[PDB]
Short mmCIF file of N, CA and C and ligand atoms in Angstrom, two decimals:
data_model
loop_
_atom_site.label_atom_id
_atom_site.label_comp_id
_atom_site.label_asym_id
_atom_site.label_seq_id
_atom_site.Cartn_x
_atom_site.Cartn_y
_atom_site.Cartn_z
N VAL A 12 15.20 -19.66 -1.42
CA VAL A 12 13.82 -20.03 -1.93
C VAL A 12 13.09 -20.42 -0.52
N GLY A 13 13.73 -21.10 0.27
CA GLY A 13 13.19 -21.45 1.53
C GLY A 13 14.27 -21.97 2.49
N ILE A 14 13.84 -22.93 3.44
CA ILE A 14 14.75 -23.47 4.40
C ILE A 14 14.17 -24.74 4.89
N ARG A 15 14.94 -25.78 5.13
CA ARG A 15 14.67 -26.99 5.66
C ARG A 15 15.50 -27.38 6.93
N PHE A 16 14.92 -28.19 7.71
CA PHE A 16 15.58 -28.71 8.90
C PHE A 16 15.78 -30.18 8.75
N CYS A 17 16.05 -30.93 9.87
CA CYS A 17 16.34 -32.32 9.89
C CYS A 17 15.18 -33.06 9.47
N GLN A 18 15.26 -34.40 9.44
CA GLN A 18 14.24 -35.40 9.55
C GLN A 18 14.20 -36.12 10.82
N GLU A 19 15.28 -36.42 11.51
CA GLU A 19 15.36 -37.02 12.73
C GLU A 19 16.20 -36.24 13.86
N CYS A 20 16.69 -35.19 13.53
CA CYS A 20 17.58 -34.41 14.53
C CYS A 20 16.99 -33.00 14.89
N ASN A 21 15.84 -32.60 14.31
CA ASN A 21 15.24 -31.35 14.58
C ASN A 21 16.21 -30.18 14.64
N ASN A 22 16.99 -30.06 13.57
CA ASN A 22 18.00 -28.99 13.61
C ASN A 22 18.19 -28.37 12.10
N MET A 23 18.69 -27.09 12.13
CA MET A 23 18.60 -26.38 10.84
C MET A 23 19.77 -26.86 10.02
N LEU A 24 19.62 -26.64 8.59
CA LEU A 24 20.39 -27.19 7.57
C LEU A 24 21.03 -26.08 6.83
N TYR A 25 22.38 -26.26 6.49
CA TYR A 25 23.16 -25.38 5.50
C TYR A 25 23.22 -26.00 4.17
N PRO A 26 23.63 -25.49 3.24
CA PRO A 26 23.77 -25.99 1.90
C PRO A 26 25.27 -26.47 1.74
N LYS A 27 25.37 -27.47 0.72
CA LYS A 27 26.69 -28.11 0.48
C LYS A 27 26.53 -28.80 -0.87
N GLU A 28 27.68 -29.21 -1.47
CA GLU A 28 27.68 -29.79 -2.78
C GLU A 28 28.38 -31.17 -2.57
N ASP A 29 28.24 -32.12 -3.50
CA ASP A 29 28.75 -33.40 -3.44
C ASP A 29 30.17 -33.34 -4.21
N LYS A 30 31.20 -33.70 -3.53
CA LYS A 30 32.43 -33.69 -4.12
C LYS A 30 32.63 -34.72 -5.26
N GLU A 31 31.81 -35.90 -5.18
CA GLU A 31 31.92 -36.91 -6.13
C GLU A 31 30.83 -36.73 -7.31
N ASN A 32 29.53 -36.82 -6.94
CA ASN A 32 28.57 -36.66 -8.00
C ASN A 32 28.30 -35.31 -8.45
N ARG A 33 28.81 -34.24 -7.88
CA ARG A 33 28.66 -32.87 -8.27
C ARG A 33 27.13 -32.51 -8.30
N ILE A 34 26.53 -32.49 -7.09
CA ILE A 34 25.13 -32.19 -6.83
C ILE A 34 25.01 -31.37 -5.63
N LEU A 35 24.12 -30.40 -5.60
CA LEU A 35 23.92 -29.61 -4.33
C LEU A 35 23.34 -30.56 -3.16
N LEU A 36 23.97 -30.87 -2.25
CA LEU A 36 23.68 -31.84 -1.25
C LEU A 36 23.50 -31.08 0.13
N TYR A 37 22.19 -30.56 0.36
CA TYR A 37 21.97 -29.94 1.62
C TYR A 37 22.15 -30.93 2.81
N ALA A 38 23.22 -30.62 3.62
CA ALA A 38 23.70 -31.57 4.63
C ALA A 38 23.58 -30.88 5.98
N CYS A 39 23.10 -31.57 7.06
CA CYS A 39 23.30 -31.05 8.37
C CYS A 39 24.74 -30.87 8.81
N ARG A 40 25.06 -29.85 9.40
CA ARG A 40 26.46 -29.64 9.96
C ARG A 40 26.46 -30.05 11.45
N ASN A 41 25.42 -29.83 12.07
CA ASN A 41 25.34 -30.34 13.51
C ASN A 41 25.06 -31.82 13.56
N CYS A 42 24.66 -32.44 12.46
CA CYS A 42 24.55 -33.97 12.43
C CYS A 42 24.88 -34.48 11.00
N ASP A 43 24.53 -35.54 10.73
CA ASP A 43 24.99 -36.32 9.49
C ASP A 43 23.70 -36.68 8.62
N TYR A 44 22.84 -35.77 8.35
CA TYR A 44 21.66 -35.87 7.42
C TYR A 44 21.93 -35.24 6.28
N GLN A 45 21.54 -35.80 5.05
CA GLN A 45 21.72 -35.16 3.81
C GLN A 45 20.49 -35.40 2.94
N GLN A 46 20.35 -34.58 1.97
CA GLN A 46 19.39 -34.84 0.83
C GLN A 46 19.83 -33.99 -0.39
N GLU A 47 19.30 -34.56 -1.50
CA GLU A 47 19.47 -33.94 -2.82
C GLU A 47 18.66 -32.67 -2.97
N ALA A 48 19.23 -31.80 -3.68
CA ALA A 48 18.53 -30.45 -3.87
C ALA A 48 17.74 -30.43 -5.14
N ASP A 49 16.29 -30.85 -4.84
CA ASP A 49 15.32 -30.75 -5.95
C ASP A 49 15.36 -29.38 -6.60
N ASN A 50 15.19 -28.29 -5.87
CA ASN A 50 15.11 -26.95 -6.39
C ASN A 50 16.46 -26.56 -7.13
N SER A 51 17.61 -26.94 -6.63
CA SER A 51 18.84 -26.44 -7.26
C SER A 51 19.10 -25.03 -7.10
N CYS A 52 18.46 -24.38 -6.24
CA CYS A 52 18.59 -23.02 -6.02
C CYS A 52 18.95 -22.78 -4.52
N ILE A 53 19.86 -21.82 -4.19
CA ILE A 53 20.57 -21.68 -2.89
C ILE A 53 20.16 -20.32 -2.32
N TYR A 54 20.01 -19.20 -2.99
CA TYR A 54 19.89 -17.87 -2.45
C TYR A 54 19.14 -16.99 -3.51
N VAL A 55 18.23 -16.09 -2.92
CA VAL A 55 17.55 -15.18 -3.63
C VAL A 55 17.47 -13.96 -2.88
N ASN A 56 17.52 -12.64 -3.47
CA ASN A 56 17.45 -11.35 -2.74
C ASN A 56 16.83 -10.35 -3.62
N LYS A 57 15.71 -9.77 -3.24
CA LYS A 57 14.98 -8.75 -3.97
C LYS A 57 15.15 -7.49 -3.19
N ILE A 58 16.36 -6.71 -3.48
CA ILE A 58 16.59 -5.52 -2.58
C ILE A 58 15.74 -4.41 -2.88
N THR A 59 15.31 -4.28 -4.14
CA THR A 59 14.46 -3.10 -4.50
C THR A 59 12.92 -3.50 -4.18
N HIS A 60 12.57 -4.83 -3.97
CA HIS A 60 11.28 -5.28 -3.52
C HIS A 60 10.21 -4.91 -4.48
N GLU A 61 10.24 -5.55 -5.66
CA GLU A 61 9.16 -5.39 -6.63
C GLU A 61 7.92 -6.07 -6.15
N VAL A 62 8.10 -7.01 -5.26
CA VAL A 62 6.94 -7.93 -4.74
C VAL A 62 5.82 -6.93 -4.23
N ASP A 63 4.70 -7.01 -4.95
CA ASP A 63 3.56 -6.06 -4.61
C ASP A 63 3.07 -6.55 -3.28
N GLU A 64 2.29 -5.61 -2.62
CA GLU A 64 1.73 -5.88 -1.24
C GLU A 64 0.52 -6.79 -1.26
N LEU A 65 -0.03 -7.03 -2.58
CA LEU A 65 -1.23 -7.88 -2.67
C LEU A 65 -1.00 -9.27 -2.05
N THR A 66 0.33 -9.78 -2.06
CA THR A 66 0.54 -11.03 -1.52
C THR A 66 0.36 -11.18 -0.04
N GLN A 67 0.23 -9.99 0.70
CA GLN A 67 0.06 -10.03 2.14
C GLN A 67 -0.90 -9.05 2.75
N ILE A 68 -1.79 -8.60 1.94
CA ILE A 68 -2.86 -7.76 2.51
C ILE A 68 -3.93 -8.73 3.06
N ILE A 69 -4.42 -8.38 4.22
CA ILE A 69 -5.25 -9.26 4.95
C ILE A 69 -6.70 -8.90 4.36
N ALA A 70 -7.58 -9.96 4.33
CA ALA A 70 -8.90 -9.80 3.78
C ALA A 70 -9.85 -9.05 4.68
N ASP A 71 -9.66 -9.38 5.95
CA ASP A 71 -10.65 -8.70 6.95
C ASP A 71 -10.59 -7.15 7.09
N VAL A 72 -9.61 -6.60 6.38
CA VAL A 72 -9.65 -5.17 6.53
C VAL A 72 -10.82 -4.48 5.88
N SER A 73 -11.52 -5.28 5.12
CA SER A 73 -12.70 -4.60 4.35
C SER A 73 -13.80 -4.40 5.35
N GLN A 74 -13.97 -5.20 6.41
CA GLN A 74 -14.91 -5.05 7.41
C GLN A 74 -14.39 -4.11 8.53
N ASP A 75 -13.39 -3.23 8.25
CA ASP A 75 -13.00 -2.18 9.22
C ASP A 75 -13.88 -0.98 9.05
N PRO A 76 -14.50 -0.57 10.00
CA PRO A 76 -15.45 0.60 9.94
C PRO A 76 -14.88 1.87 9.40
N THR A 77 -13.66 2.10 9.79
CA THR A 77 -13.04 3.52 9.63
C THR A 77 -12.54 3.81 8.15
N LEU A 78 -12.32 2.78 7.35
CA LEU A 78 -11.76 3.03 5.99
C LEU A 78 -12.87 3.52 5.14
N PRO A 79 -12.47 4.18 4.02
CA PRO A 79 -13.45 4.71 3.04
C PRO A 79 -14.28 3.66 2.49
N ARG A 80 -15.26 3.99 1.63
CA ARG A 80 -16.01 2.93 0.87
C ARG A 80 -16.50 3.54 -0.45
N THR A 81 -16.16 2.84 -1.61
CA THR A 81 -16.37 3.42 -2.95
C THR A 81 -17.37 2.34 -3.69
N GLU A 82 -18.44 2.82 -4.27
CA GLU A 82 -19.38 2.01 -4.91
C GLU A 82 -18.88 1.36 -6.26
N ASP A 83 -17.96 2.12 -7.03
CA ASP A 83 -17.47 1.69 -8.23
C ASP A 83 -16.40 0.58 -8.05
N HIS A 84 -15.92 0.10 -9.23
CA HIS A 84 -14.92 -0.97 -9.23
C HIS A 84 -15.40 -2.24 -8.62
N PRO A 85 -16.36 -2.78 -9.21
CA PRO A 85 -17.01 -4.09 -8.57
C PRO A 85 -15.97 -5.16 -8.67
N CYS A 86 -16.07 -6.14 -7.74
CA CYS A 86 -15.22 -7.21 -7.72
C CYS A 86 -15.50 -8.19 -8.86
N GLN A 87 -14.53 -9.09 -9.05
CA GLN A 87 -14.50 -9.93 -10.29
C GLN A 87 -15.23 -11.27 -9.99
N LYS A 88 -14.87 -11.99 -8.98
CA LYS A 88 -15.52 -13.34 -8.73
C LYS A 88 -16.95 -13.12 -8.40
N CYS A 89 -17.28 -12.12 -7.70
CA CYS A 89 -18.61 -11.75 -7.48
C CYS A 89 -18.84 -10.23 -7.77
N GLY A 90 -19.99 -9.86 -8.38
CA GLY A 90 -20.19 -8.54 -8.67
C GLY A 90 -19.98 -7.60 -7.64
N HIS A 91 -20.89 -7.50 -6.64
CA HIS A 91 -20.78 -6.87 -5.34
C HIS A 91 -20.22 -5.49 -5.52
N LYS A 92 -21.02 -4.56 -6.13
CA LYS A 92 -20.55 -3.35 -6.53
C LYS A 92 -20.52 -2.33 -5.37
N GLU A 93 -19.41 -2.64 -4.51
CA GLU A 93 -19.22 -1.61 -3.44
C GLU A 93 -18.00 -2.24 -2.68
N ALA A 94 -16.82 -1.42 -2.53
CA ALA A 94 -15.66 -1.97 -2.08
C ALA A 94 -14.91 -0.81 -1.32
N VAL A 95 -13.72 -1.00 -0.93
CA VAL A 95 -12.86 -0.26 -0.02
C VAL A 95 -11.57 -0.01 -0.60
N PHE A 96 -10.87 1.16 -0.49
CA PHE A 96 -9.60 1.50 -0.96
C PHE A 96 -8.82 2.05 0.08
N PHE A 97 -7.48 1.97 0.07
CA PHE A 97 -6.59 2.46 1.10
C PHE A 97 -5.05 2.39 0.48
N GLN A 98 -4.23 3.29 0.81
CA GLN A 98 -2.88 3.35 0.29
C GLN A 98 -2.08 2.34 0.92
N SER A 99 -0.83 2.12 0.37
CA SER A 99 0.02 1.12 0.87
C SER A 99 0.42 1.31 2.38
N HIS A 100 0.73 2.57 2.63
CA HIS A 100 1.24 2.87 3.99
C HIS A 100 2.44 2.03 4.45
N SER A 101 3.23 1.58 3.54
CA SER A 101 4.36 0.80 3.80
C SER A 101 5.62 1.40 3.35
N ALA A 102 6.39 1.92 4.34
CA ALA A 102 7.65 2.62 3.98
C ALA A 102 8.59 1.71 3.42
N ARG A 103 9.25 2.28 2.27
CA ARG A 103 10.34 1.75 1.60
C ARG A 103 9.83 0.43 0.81
N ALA A 104 8.67 -0.01 0.81
CA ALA A 104 8.25 -1.07 -0.06
C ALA A 104 8.16 -0.70 -1.52
N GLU A 105 7.66 0.57 -1.77
CA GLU A 105 7.49 1.15 -3.09
C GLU A 105 7.05 2.53 -2.92
N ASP A 106 7.51 3.47 -3.87
CA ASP A 106 7.06 4.82 -3.73
C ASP A 106 5.90 5.14 -4.80
N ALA A 107 4.99 4.23 -4.90
CA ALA A 107 3.77 4.33 -5.81
C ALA A 107 2.55 4.37 -4.95
N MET A 108 1.80 5.34 -5.00
CA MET A 108 0.63 5.52 -4.28
C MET A 108 -0.56 4.75 -4.85
N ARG A 109 -0.42 3.66 -5.63
CA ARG A 109 -1.43 2.94 -6.09
C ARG A 109 -2.47 2.50 -5.20
N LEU A 110 -3.67 2.84 -5.29
CA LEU A 110 -4.81 2.53 -4.36
C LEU A 110 -4.96 0.98 -4.45
N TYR A 111 -5.08 0.40 -3.24
CA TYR A 111 -5.37 -1.02 -3.12
C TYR A 111 -6.87 -1.38 -2.75
N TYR A 112 -7.44 -2.19 -3.56
CA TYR A 112 -8.87 -2.44 -3.34
C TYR A 112 -9.09 -3.79 -2.86
N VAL A 113 -10.08 -4.11 -1.91
CA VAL A 113 -10.46 -5.36 -1.49
C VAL A 113 -11.88 -5.40 -1.45
N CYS A 114 -12.49 -6.61 -1.91
CA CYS A 114 -13.98 -6.69 -1.89
C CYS A 114 -14.39 -6.87 -0.47
N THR A 115 -15.72 -6.47 -0.16
CA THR A 115 -16.25 -6.46 1.17
C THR A 115 -17.36 -7.44 1.28
N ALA A 116 -17.37 -8.41 0.61
CA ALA A 116 -18.48 -9.48 0.79
C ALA A 116 -18.15 -10.26 2.06
N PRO A 117 -19.12 -11.00 2.64
CA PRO A 117 -18.84 -11.73 3.91
C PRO A 117 -17.83 -12.85 3.70
N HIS A 118 -17.71 -13.49 2.64
CA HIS A 118 -16.83 -14.60 2.29
C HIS A 118 -15.85 -14.22 1.23
N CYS A 119 -16.04 -13.16 0.38
CA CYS A 119 -15.18 -12.83 -0.63
C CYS A 119 -13.90 -12.20 0.03
N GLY A 120 -13.20 -11.50 -0.83
CA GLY A 120 -11.90 -10.90 -0.44
C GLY A 120 -10.88 -10.90 -1.55
N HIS A 121 -11.28 -11.31 -2.82
CA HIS A 121 -10.38 -11.05 -3.98
C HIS A 121 -9.93 -9.61 -4.12
N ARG A 122 -8.56 -9.45 -3.98
CA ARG A 122 -7.95 -8.27 -3.91
C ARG A 122 -7.33 -7.88 -5.28
N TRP A 123 -7.39 -6.50 -5.62
CA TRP A 123 -6.82 -6.08 -6.80
C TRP A 123 -6.38 -4.68 -6.78
N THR A 124 -5.60 -4.16 -7.66
CA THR A 124 -5.11 -2.79 -7.78
C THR A 124 -5.32 -2.33 -9.22
N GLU A 125 -5.66 -1.14 -9.51
CA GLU A 125 -5.89 -0.46 -10.77
C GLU A 125 -5.78 1.07 -10.63
N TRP B 679 -5.82 67.08 17.43
CA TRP B 679 -6.70 67.15 16.23
C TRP B 679 -7.36 65.90 16.20
N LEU B 680 -6.89 64.68 16.57
CA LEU B 680 -7.58 63.50 16.66
C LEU B 680 -8.80 63.53 17.53
N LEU B 681 -8.60 64.34 18.59
CA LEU B 681 -9.74 64.59 19.48
C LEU B 681 -10.98 65.11 18.70
N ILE B 682 -10.75 65.85 17.69
CA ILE B 682 -11.94 66.25 16.81
C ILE B 682 -12.20 65.30 15.81
N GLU B 683 -11.23 64.77 15.06
CA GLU B 683 -11.53 63.71 14.08
C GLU B 683 -11.94 62.39 14.68
N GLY B 684 -11.13 61.82 15.57
CA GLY B 684 -11.48 60.56 16.13
C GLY B 684 -11.33 59.34 15.31
N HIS B 685 -10.88 58.25 15.82
CA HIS B 685 -10.67 57.01 15.22
C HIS B 685 -11.35 55.92 16.01
N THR B 686 -11.62 54.80 15.25
CA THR B 686 -12.41 53.73 15.76
C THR B 686 -12.23 52.51 14.92
N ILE B 687 -12.89 51.45 15.39
CA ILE B 687 -12.93 50.12 14.69
C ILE B 687 -13.92 49.23 15.25
N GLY B 688 -14.71 48.61 14.26
CA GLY B 688 -15.91 47.86 14.75
C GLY B 688 -16.18 46.82 13.67
N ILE B 689 -17.38 46.19 13.87
CA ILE B 689 -17.87 45.09 12.99
C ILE B 689 -18.15 45.59 11.64
N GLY B 690 -18.51 46.84 11.50
CA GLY B 690 -18.71 47.32 10.12
C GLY B 690 -17.46 47.48 9.37
N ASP B 691 -16.22 47.44 9.99
CA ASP B 691 -15.05 47.50 9.32
C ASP B 691 -14.57 46.04 9.01
N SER B 692 -15.27 44.95 9.41
CA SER B 692 -15.01 43.66 9.07
C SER B 692 -16.05 43.00 8.12
N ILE B 693 -17.18 43.58 7.95
CA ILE B 693 -18.27 43.06 6.96
C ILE B 693 -17.82 43.59 5.75
N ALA B 694 -17.99 42.76 4.68
CA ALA B 694 -17.67 43.04 3.25
C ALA B 694 -19.06 42.92 2.49
N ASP B 695 -18.99 43.24 1.18
CA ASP B 695 -20.25 43.26 0.42
C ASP B 695 -20.54 41.84 0.19
N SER B 696 -21.84 41.62 -0.11
CA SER B 696 -22.37 40.24 -0.47
C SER B 696 -21.73 39.81 -1.73
N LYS B 697 -21.54 40.58 -2.75
CA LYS B 697 -20.78 40.15 -3.91
C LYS B 697 -19.43 39.69 -3.56
N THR B 698 -18.75 40.35 -2.71
CA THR B 698 -17.46 39.91 -2.18
C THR B 698 -17.52 38.46 -1.62
N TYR B 699 -18.50 38.24 -0.77
CA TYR B 699 -18.65 37.11 -0.15
C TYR B 699 -18.84 35.88 -1.16
N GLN B 700 -19.78 36.19 -2.19
CA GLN B 700 -19.99 35.26 -3.19
C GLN B 700 -18.81 34.96 -3.99
N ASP B 701 -17.92 36.01 -4.36
CA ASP B 701 -16.77 35.77 -5.10
C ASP B 701 -15.69 34.91 -4.27
N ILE B 702 -15.65 35.23 -2.92
CA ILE B 702 -14.77 34.45 -2.25
C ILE B 702 -15.17 33.03 -2.13
N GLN B 703 -16.43 32.74 -1.90
CA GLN B 703 -16.89 31.34 -1.87
C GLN B 703 -16.58 30.66 -3.16
N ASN B 704 -16.89 31.34 -4.25
CA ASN B 704 -16.61 30.80 -5.55
C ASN B 704 -15.11 30.41 -5.70
N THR B 705 -14.17 31.29 -5.30
CA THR B 705 -12.82 31.06 -5.37
C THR B 705 -12.44 29.89 -4.52
N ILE B 706 -12.93 29.67 -3.27
CA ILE B 706 -12.70 28.57 -2.39
C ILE B 706 -13.17 27.28 -2.96
N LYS B 707 -14.41 27.34 -3.63
CA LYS B 707 -14.98 26.18 -4.26
C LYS B 707 -14.06 25.72 -5.37
N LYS B 708 -13.57 26.65 -6.30
CA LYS B 708 -12.75 26.29 -7.28
C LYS B 708 -11.43 25.69 -6.88
N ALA B 709 -10.73 26.20 -5.81
CA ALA B 709 -9.68 25.76 -5.36
C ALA B 709 -9.82 24.26 -4.71
N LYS B 710 -10.90 24.13 -4.02
CA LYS B 710 -11.17 22.82 -3.46
C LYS B 710 -11.38 21.75 -4.60
N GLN B 711 -12.09 22.15 -5.77
CA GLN B 711 -12.29 21.30 -6.85
C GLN B 711 -10.88 20.94 -7.53
N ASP B 712 -10.06 22.07 -7.64
CA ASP B 712 -8.74 21.81 -8.24
C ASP B 712 -7.90 20.77 -7.48
N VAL B 713 -7.83 20.86 -6.06
CA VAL B 713 -7.07 20.01 -5.33
C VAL B 713 -7.69 18.67 -5.34
N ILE B 714 -9.03 18.54 -5.42
CA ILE B 714 -9.70 17.36 -5.56
C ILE B 714 -9.13 16.66 -6.94
N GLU B 715 -9.11 17.45 -8.00
CA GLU B 715 -8.67 16.81 -9.25
C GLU B 715 -7.27 16.45 -9.11
N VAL B 716 -6.20 17.21 -8.55
CA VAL B 716 -4.79 16.77 -8.46
C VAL B 716 -4.79 15.57 -7.61
N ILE B 717 -5.54 15.46 -6.44
CA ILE B 717 -5.32 14.20 -5.61
C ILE B 717 -5.95 13.03 -6.31
N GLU B 718 -7.01 13.32 -7.21
CA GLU B 718 -7.41 12.13 -8.00
C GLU B 718 -6.37 11.74 -9.01
N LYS B 719 -5.71 12.64 -9.64
CA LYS B 719 -4.69 12.21 -10.55
C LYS B 719 -3.62 11.47 -9.68
N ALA B 720 -3.18 11.93 -8.58
CA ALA B 720 -2.14 11.15 -7.79
C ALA B 720 -2.64 9.82 -7.43
N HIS B 721 -3.92 9.57 -7.02
CA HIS B 721 -4.38 8.30 -6.83
C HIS B 721 -4.39 7.36 -7.92
N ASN B 722 -4.73 7.92 -9.13
CA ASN B 722 -4.69 7.16 -10.39
C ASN B 722 -3.33 7.02 -10.90
N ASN B 723 -2.28 7.59 -10.32
CA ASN B 723 -0.89 7.54 -10.76
C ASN B 723 -0.73 8.04 -12.15
N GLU B 724 -0.91 9.35 -12.35
CA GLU B 724 -0.38 10.08 -13.47
C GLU B 724 0.22 11.41 -13.11
N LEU B 725 0.45 11.65 -11.77
CA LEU B 725 1.20 12.87 -11.40
C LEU B 725 2.64 12.57 -11.55
N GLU B 726 3.26 13.12 -12.76
CA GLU B 726 4.69 12.86 -13.09
C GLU B 726 5.49 13.50 -12.00
ZN1 ZN C 1 22.16 -31.95 13.06
ZN1 ZN C 2 -16.04 -10.10 -4.31
#
C-alpha cells in the first residue's frame, strides 16, 4: 500500500508480526522502533496494470500548442465547449487506443475518457 | 524500318482525359473518407 520510515531514526522499515499478540508490527530492523499496522496489508501488485492513465495525466498538456483541438465533448464542471484529445502513448500500460480528453480552461483540467 | 515508322514519348503520352482525372479524384476522395471512417472507429474503440 505504501512505505513508512522511522520516527526518531530516519530509516526505512520492514514488516513483522507480534509473536505474543499476533498483530502485524512494522518494526525497524536497523533500530528498535515499532508500530501497529492500521492498514493490516503488506503487499500489492498489479502486473496487468488495470490502473488507467487518468491518475497521472498532467493538466497543463491542454495548453500545449501542438496537440489537436476538438469543439465537441464539453467539460463537466464547466461547460467550456472545446477541448483536446491524445492517445495514451504509453507502452505496455494497455493496448486500448481510448482517446484521453482534458479540458482547456485556464483553471479547469477535469479529465475524462469516452 | 523504325527509321520510317519512328518512336517517341512526350507529355501527350502522360496526359489523360478529364473524365479520367475526375474519376481518379473521386476514387481518392472515397478512399480517404473510408480510412477516416476506420480510424474514427479505432478511436471510438469498436475495431474488433
Ligand atoms: Zn533503525
Ligand atoms: Zn472544464
